Amino acid sequence: YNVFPRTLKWSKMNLTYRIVNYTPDMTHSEVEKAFKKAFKVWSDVTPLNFTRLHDGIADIMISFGIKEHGDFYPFDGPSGLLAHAFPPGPNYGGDAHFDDDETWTSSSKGYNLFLVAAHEFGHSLGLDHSKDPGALMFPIYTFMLPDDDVQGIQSLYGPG
Amino acid sequence: YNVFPRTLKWSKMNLTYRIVNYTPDMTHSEVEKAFKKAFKVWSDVTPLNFTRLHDGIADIMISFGIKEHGDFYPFDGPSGLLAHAFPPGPNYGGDAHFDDDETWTSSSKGYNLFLVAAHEFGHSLGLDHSKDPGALMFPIYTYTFMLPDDDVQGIQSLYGPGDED
Numbered sequence: 001y002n003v004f005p006r007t008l009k010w011s012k013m014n015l016t017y018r019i020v021n022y023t024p025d026m027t028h029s030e031v032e033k034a035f036k037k038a039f040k041v042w043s044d045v046t047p048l049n050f051t052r053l054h055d056g057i058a059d060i061m062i063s064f065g066i067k068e069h070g071d072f073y074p075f076d077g078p079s080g081l082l083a084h085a086f087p088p089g090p091n092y093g094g095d096a097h098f099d100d101d102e103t104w105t106s107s108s109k110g111y112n113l114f115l116v117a118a119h120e121f122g123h124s125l126g127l128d129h130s131k132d133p134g135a136l137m138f139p140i141y142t143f144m145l146p147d148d149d150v151q152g153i154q155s156l157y158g159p160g
Numbered sequence: 161y162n163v164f165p166r167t168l169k170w171s172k173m174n175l176t177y178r179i180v181n182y183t184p185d186m187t188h189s190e191v192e193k194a195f196k197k198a199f200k201v202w203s204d205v206t207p208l209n210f211t212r213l214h215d216g217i218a219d220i221m222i223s224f225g226i227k228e229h230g231d232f233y234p235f236d237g238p239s240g241l242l243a244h245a246f247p248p249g250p251n252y253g254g255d256a257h258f259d260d261d262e263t264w265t266s267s268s269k270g271y272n273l274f275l276v277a278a279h280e281f282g283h284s285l286g287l288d289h290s291k292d293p294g295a296l297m298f299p300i301y302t303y304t305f306m307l308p309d310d311d312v313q314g315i316q317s318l319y320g321p322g323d324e325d
């Protein structure tokens with residue numbers, strides 16, 4: 001028999017990401033900085049490293065989109081699903097999509113992009129949802145990575 | 161804190177299924193009996209329970225369709241691909257699609273909906289294809305039922321035996 005193995009985690013410690021498109025809600029600069037920040041969250045506590053490609057195929061393809069945007073996990077206008085990301089793996093694995101019918105903001109007026117991104121980037125790293133309300137990976141939107149997550153990611157990749 | 165499951169599988173033992181529409185070939189009753197039986201193949205050897213919803217959103221949506229029907233895998237007219245289903249996961253995860261350009265039957269002539277369904281639902285639960293030419297999860301259709309042991313050992317690695325009697 002065969003089942004569908006899951007890529008529990010990335011093989012390599014060096015990962016590439018590409019920001020394909022941009023929300024109208026923040027400067028390009030602010031966006032790039034929000035993601036660099038969201039990757040630092042997990043690079044700080046693991047051997048993991050993130051470098052950004054400007055073209056071509058990357059391990060973590062980041063995009064913004066609305067409704068149906070090419071994977072049949074369609075978004076839903078404003079409110080509700082803020083974003084989503086695929087677990088570690090080839091092809092689609094690791095990719096992060098952000099519902100561009102939400103208002104992304106580099107602060108509090110809307111959903112802070114960096115916060116949501118850092119959350120999503122755990123899903124890209126193999127992290128599942130947490131039930132600890134203090135955990136970044138808690139499903140509900142609300143910087144120091146909480147021990148709950150530090151333990152979760154380290155359990156996979158180890159410390160730095 | 162939580163980490164992703166080693167393999168694709170359902171997080172809960174209680175799963176829901178909905179027959180979204182029906183094929184013209186067989187009656188509503190034949191279609192529901194074939195699917196109920198198809199599900200029982202798998203619940204009989206695991207702790208899984210399958211409940212049917214008449215409307216709404218189930219873990220496993222079942223529908224019949226032709227050519228392009230709402231995903232990346234269009235059907236192709238008669239013969240060729242008979243059907244397919246997606247592995248466990250959100251949205252269309254676990255959903256099974258049957259090509260309505262085929263002839264579906266509860267007998268031998270045509271394609272036996274029960275047998276194809278049994279195989280497809282295997283997919284819905286996280287089984288891929290076997291290499292054993294006598295495994296239910298063998299990719300190629302053959303008419304004949306006792307669930308082969310490669311399939312049993314396959315599903316139990318995923319969800320355990322349930323009650324072993």
Ligand SMILES: CNC(=O)[C@@H](NC(=O)c1ccc(-c2ccc(NC(=O)c3cc4ccccc4o3)cc2)o1)C1CCCCC1
Binds near residue numbers: 296
């Ligand atoms: C005509 N077109 C096809 O067949 C294409 N098939 C499909 O799309 C497809 C979907 C599901 C099946 C299928 C295959 C085997 C069985 N189980 C059994 O037939 C079975 C019955 C049985 C009874 C006792 C023990 C073991 C058993 O196994 C049940 C269903 O086939 C396929 C062809 C091959 C390449 C890809 C495209």
Ligand SMILES: [Ca+2]
Binds near residue numbers: 101
């Ligand atoms: Ca939304």
Ligand SMILES: [Ca+2]
Binds near residue numbers: 058059089090091093
């Ligand atoms: Ca990718």
Ligand SMILES: [Ca+2]
Binds near residue numbers: 025100101102103104
């Ligand atoms: Ca907007």
Ligand SMILES: [Ca+2]
Binds near residue numbers: 239
């Ligand atoms: Ca066909």
Ligand SMILES: [Ca+2]
Binds near residue numbers: 220221
């Ligand atoms: Ca589904």
Ligand SMILES: [Ca+2]
Binds near residue numbers: 183184260263
């Ligand atoms: Ca038909």
Ligand SMILES: [Zn+2]
Binds near residue numbers: 069071073084097
């Ligand atoms: Zn998407």
Ligand SMILES: [Zn+2]
Binds near residue numbers: 119123129137
């Ligand atoms: Zn999440």
Ligand SMILES: [Zn+2]
Binds near residue numbers: 233
């Ligand atoms: Zn389909």
Ligand SMILES: [Zn+2]
Binds near residue numbers: 279280283289299
């Ligand atoms: Zn198959």
